[PDB]
Scaffold this motif. Structure first.
Motif, mmCIF file in Angstrom:
data_model
loop_
_atom_site.group_PDB
_atom_site.id
_atom_site.type_symbol
_atom_site.label_atom_id
_atom_site.label_comp_id
_atom_site.label_asym_id
_atom_site.label_seq_id
_atom_site.Cartn_x
_atom_site.Cartn_y
_atom_site.Cartn_z
ATOM 1 N N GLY A 260 -0.977 -33.349 -37.127
ATOM 2 C CA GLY A 260 -1.700 -32.566 -36.141
ATOM 3 C C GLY A 260 -1.519 -33.108 -34.736
ATOM 4 N N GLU B 46 0.636 -35.399 -33.767
ATOM 5 C CA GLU B 46 2.047 -35.408 -33.428
ATOM 6 C C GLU B 46 2.487 -34.055 -32.900
ATOM 7 O OE1 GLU B 46 3.890 -36.992 -36.938
ATOM 8 O OE2 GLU B 46 3.784 -39.072 -36.166
ATOM 9 N N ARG B 47 2.073 -32.977 -33.558
ATOM 10 C CA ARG B 47 2.395 -31.641 -33.072
ATOM 11 C C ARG B 47 1.755 -31.384 -31.718
ATOM 12 N NH1 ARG B 47 -0.990 -27.891 -33.677
ATOM 13 N NH2 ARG B 47 -1.935 -28.918 -35.508
ATOM 14 N N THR C 219 3.703 -33.600 -28.818
ATOM 15 C CA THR C 219 5.056 -33.140 -28.502
ATOM 16 C C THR C 219 5.052 -31.694 -28.023
ATOM 17 O OG1 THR C 219 5.696 -32.265 -30.687
ATOM 18 C CG2 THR C 219 5.842 -34.656 -30.326
ATOM 19 N N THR C 220 4.454 -30.792 -28.799
ATOM 20 C CA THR C 220 4.375 -29.371 -28.433
ATOM 21 C C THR C 220 3.418 -29.174 -27.258
ATOM 22 O OG1 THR C 220 5.103 -28.310 -30.512
ATOM 23 C CG2 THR C 220 3.363 -27.135 -29.267
ATOM 24 N N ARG D 182 4.754 -22.801 -34.620
ATOM 25 C CA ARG D 182 4.777 -24.243 -34.414
ATOM 26 C C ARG D 182 3.896 -24.974 -35.423
ATOM 27 N NH1 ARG D 182 6.010 -28.622 -35.010
ATOM 28 N NH2 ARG D 182 6.134 -30.255 -33.365
ATOM 29 N N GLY E 2 4.738 -27.668 -38.623
ATOM 30 C CA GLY E 2 3.997 -28.901 -38.827
ATOM 31 C C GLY E 2 3.752 -29.195 -40.297
ATOM 32 N N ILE F 68 4.230 -32.581 -42.891
ATOM 33 C CA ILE F 68 3.091 -33.195 -43.573
ATOM 34 C C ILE F 68 3.208 -33.066 -45.102
ATOM 35 C CG2 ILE F 68 0.610 -32.988 -43.895
ATOM 36 C CD1 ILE F 68 1.003 -31.950 -40.765
#
Ligand SMILES: [Cl-]
Ligand SMILES: [Cl-]
Ligand SMILES: [Cl-]
Ligand SMILES: [Cl-]
Ligand SMILES: [Cl-]
Ligand SMILES: [Cl-]
Ligand SMILES: [Zn+2]
Ligand SMILES: [Zn+2]
Ligand SMILES: [Zn+2]
Ligand SMILES: [Zn+2]
Ligand SMILES: [Zn+2]
Ligand SMILES: [Zn+2]
Ligand SMILES: [Zn+2]
Ligand SMILES: [Zn+2]
Ligand SMILES: [Zn+2]
Ligand SMILES: [Zn+2]
Ligand SMILES: [Zn+2]
Ligand SMILES: [Zn+2]
Ligand SMILES: [Zn+2]
Ligand SMILES: [Zn+2]
Ligand SMILES: [Zn+2]
Ligand SMILES: [Zn+2]
Lengths: 270, 268, 270, 268, 269
Positions: free
Chosen positions: D177, D179-180, D183-184, E61, E65, E69
């Motif tokens: 979560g 990390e997304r 970066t995003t 997006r 993810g 995971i």
């Protein structure tokens, strides 16, 4: 749709020439208050249209779950009981029949053609017997599972793994049923549907005192805006029903059958 | 249609407005449309957000009742597939599950569940249930007993017991959800303030619309007030989703649908 | 309602506006409505979004508190169905579960639990709980040892021990949910910028409205003030939902309800 | 607060507008407020939506961290309830769990973790963990070792190994979560385009306002500029919630609470 | 892209400045008030429609993810449950990594045979390619490795299911992206708003020209940029799997997934 665009030109062409005779009478329409009424109506339309898209998103999603639940239900059978191809073939019949049966359900069309193609005429009778055939089929699918459990081929643990997939399917049946029956208007989108209609024709009678012969050309543009947005929302209020697109609901039942056949090696040709 | 009071208090506030325009410049009072556009746009934004909250709530109601149907359906179904012998246990659990749906509709409506409870359960249970300060929640406890005993009796394993337990959890969340909906109204503040300023505005409007429209004031000062009131009523229309009239959820309908679905599943 | 302080400080500002209008064209200050019309609409838009983001935190606060009743109800239910015999554990567990509700009400209000904790529990515990950094988390750890013992004793099996564990998870999510909502204010300056700006716009609006409405100014400026000002406090009451105001969450009612529910007939069941 | 660097530019833009207004017909430039009304309104609608999308990102940030705390407490509590004996495993695990929280803080903040990692882990681990280009994923992997060991020791059944595995899952989603989120970024267009338009709209506005307001222009024009500029920086602050600004997430605070929480649960 | 549109608008402004002389001597007025109305309306509708596109882009997006995971934890489950069975490790990681790459292809409507033969034996690559959904098939094959480990008693039904669930999670990602791709929003949300924002943008000068005279081209191009930017910001996020630069970086995303799954299984990227 284009009918209400041209009643407008008539209403403008009326308002141009009939603009003369309340010169002497003292009944005027500014644009200042109609701009208020319009900015209001457009806020409510924007909010309403927003709810309709959300209603459409839930339908698309629910159907995607049918594909996923059925794919991983069949994958679990192949991975767990890789030998029992008579069972595989039977369960894949019921899943595919559920897709078709549900699409026929939401559309209020006849399932009998797709059912006999897919299941034995005892079952097709038992299923068309029930007031809830789509539920009925899920019940039958659940038997082939629970039987492999009596037969000892499935443990309570691996039985549970597959049951959770029939749950995913059951929440979808309920999920779509609720979307379909429920009128998100409560016939109150018929209120907005008409308030937009009134405002859109009273508009030239308020615009003419500013735009003279331009009134039709600007009064239809504003109307085509307001009428598109309304009808584009009334469309997605009923996303399975008669006011909807069938290519995705049909391509979807077709993909899942194709996917389930390929997954049990009934395709390709030997 | 407590709405059609200020719909025509408006025409009377448009006529007080027309024939008393004369006096305006001499009193030093001017009502221009410009700030009433400002006000009305700020009201309409607020009305818009407020309706959205109310619709979300009605949806959440329709949803929870939807889950009674899912959870009870699959719960009957699980019982069939896992214990297809035990139709004694079938008809027992099905009656509690039906009773739950009806006992919940009553509770939400504040009506007497005793009729249906007796149609569906032995008088022993109807007594047990109505003794409880929380009878719907109790019906669930009784349904979980049939499940638990079956487990005690070896017929359900812990694993299959668990599978059916989670269905009583889904139902247990439907109960909390409806209870919370039926007791947490969209703050009386939101609904009182809006309902207030929408009224005050809709009646000062013809005074400000008259300078621009002369006699056209009613035919437009009403059409504007209908739009801003229709929208404030439609929000109060959906703030009582468990009522017994109009747009309110057909809880009686749904309850039948449940009972029929659930007997259809068990050949009755 | 310190709103009525400024609803009237505005009337005294509408008044300053009227007794300075006839030094206007002398001091050369042309001041029109249409830029303040822009400023209003921009503020309403931002007040509309901000107030909606507040209701969501209030809604979520309410939901978490709902989850307490649900999780605690079926936690009791599972003991009454799996170990229907062990009423000494039933009471021990219920005692903790109700300590949880009261304790969390205290945690979120920053009041002393010790009263409630003693009414509900042995004192060796009431100390150990008050000993702990996070008390509510500790009550939850005591409720676990109750379950955990019954599993060691062998009364609960791994499966059915697990079934009850999940419910203590459900409750540990409600704990963190309310910490996050309480210790996280709506990010700072959101209130200062949005609350500074609405006052200022309320007290300048009559200075530019007087030219158009003349005397009507206090009426129409106080109207616009009540609209933009009630809406800004409505969004502020909701920012803190565990507060003690009347628009906040009734947390003492809710904890009573939880308690009456878990002792329906003195913790006694069918 | 380079808003105040921007806000004064506007006030000098305003005096400029006042002095150079007279030579307007002489140049042929008519500037009304009405088209800036339309434009400025449209900017507010977009800002409203845009700002809204940011507060979402911030909220989602907050919730992910919220779950670290939840997931790690119940992972600890499940150990103290299933294996209240085995304290060697409690220490090794709590140490690994608290390492995770710190490794993630440093990961999101782009900082050297070696301080907190060495402070909580053996040196054969800390070298192999920093060895990895994915150190927090690695810590989680080692945390599952302890669990899996206990299961192959037989101190955990598959069922209770299962129960705890599901919190490692819960933490593995928090990683992904954050990390997304880090970066995003929101499409580098929403914040770029709207900052242009707000900035340029603020600058031109007094040239449209001065014809109407004359010497008053600096006041009204700097007010309107503040509203738009403030509401635009809010959404900029939330663009990255894992930063160090006063209005970002207090991650150092958050990670101490997690470490005190898990230590108070183990009598340390 | 839209930079020609701005220019055409300038011509329309210049056209409108020269063509203002014949206005009332051809029977026309154009006030700014009606266009402020319609223009605000379009902004409201663009405001919601933009909001719906950001959501699709967020979810695209987001689904990617969960690919990482789920695979990271399916790998972790193997290591922690069967630390010995390192042949199962490599083979599972090879399908998991190949699943990623095939999903990238599937979404992009491009050919996976390259990535596939890099990663998997040809018996597999042919078997996988024969399927009307190779990502589904890859999941099926990664399902057997888990399944045979269960038939050999190395995995109990419990710990089998533990890992089966990650396979189920991946299947949800697959169905999800497939759903984000094959369903565009009702195409009417483009023809309506694209026509309307365009048409409104090229008539705005004709109506601003009375108020602003020569000033018409700048103001008119400002308002048109603001509407046309906010319009196309929703077109980009409407195919978030596309190859445009604002679309998702699926190749980088796909490498990070391979890198992550190798770093866990002893091998070094
Ligand atoms: Cl087969
Ligand atoms: Cl097969
Ligand atoms: Cl029966
Ligand atoms: Cl310890
Ligand atoms: Cl996972
Ligand atoms: Cl300990
Ligand atoms: Zn699934
Ligand atoms: Zn087969
Ligand atoms: Zn095929
Ligand atoms: Zn269910
Ligand atoms: Zn039966
Ligand atoms: Zn009612
Ligand atoms: Zn629950
Ligand atoms: Zn008891
Ligand atoms: Zn959890
Ligand atoms: Zn006057
Ligand atoms: Zn005066
Ligand atoms: Zn310990
Ligand atoms: Zn030791
Ligand atoms: Zn270093
Ligand atoms: Zn996961
Ligand atoms: Zn290995």
């Amino acid at each position: 749709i284009i009918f209400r665009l041209l009643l407008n030109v008539l209403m403008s062409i009326i308002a141009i020439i009939s603009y003369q005779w309340y010169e002497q009478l003292g009944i005027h329409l500014t644009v200042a208050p109609f701009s208020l009424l319009g900015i209001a109506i457009a806020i409510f339309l924007g909010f309403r249209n927003s709810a309709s898209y959300s209603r459409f998103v839930e339908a698309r999603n629910l159907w995607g779950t049918v594909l996923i639940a059925e794919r991983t239900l069949v994958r679990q059978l192949r991975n767990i009981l890789p030998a029992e191809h008579d069972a595989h073939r039977r369960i894949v019949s019921y899943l595919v029949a559920f897709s078709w049966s549900l699409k026929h359900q939401l559309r209020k069309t006849d399932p009998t053609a797709d059912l006999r193609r897919l299941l034995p005429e005892e079952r097709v009778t038992e299923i068309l017997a029930s007031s809830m055939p789509t539920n009925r089929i899920l019940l039958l699918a659940g038997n082939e599972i629970g039987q492999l459990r009596e037969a000892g081929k499935l443990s309570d643990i691996t039985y549970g793994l597959m049951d959770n997939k029939l749950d995913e399917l059951a929440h979808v049946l309920g999920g779509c049923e609720r979307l379909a029956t429920t009128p998100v208007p409560f016939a109150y989108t018929l209120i907005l549907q008409r308030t937009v209609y009134l405002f859109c024709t009273l508009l030239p009678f308020a615009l003419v005192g500013d735009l003279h012969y331009m009134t039709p050309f600007v009064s239809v543009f504003i109307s085509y805006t307001f009428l598109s947005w309304d009808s584009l929302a009334e469309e997605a209020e009923d996303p399975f029903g008669t006011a909807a697109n069938d290519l995705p609901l049909n391509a979807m039942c077709n993909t899942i059958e194709r996917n389930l056949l390929d997954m049990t090696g009934q395709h390709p040709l030997p």
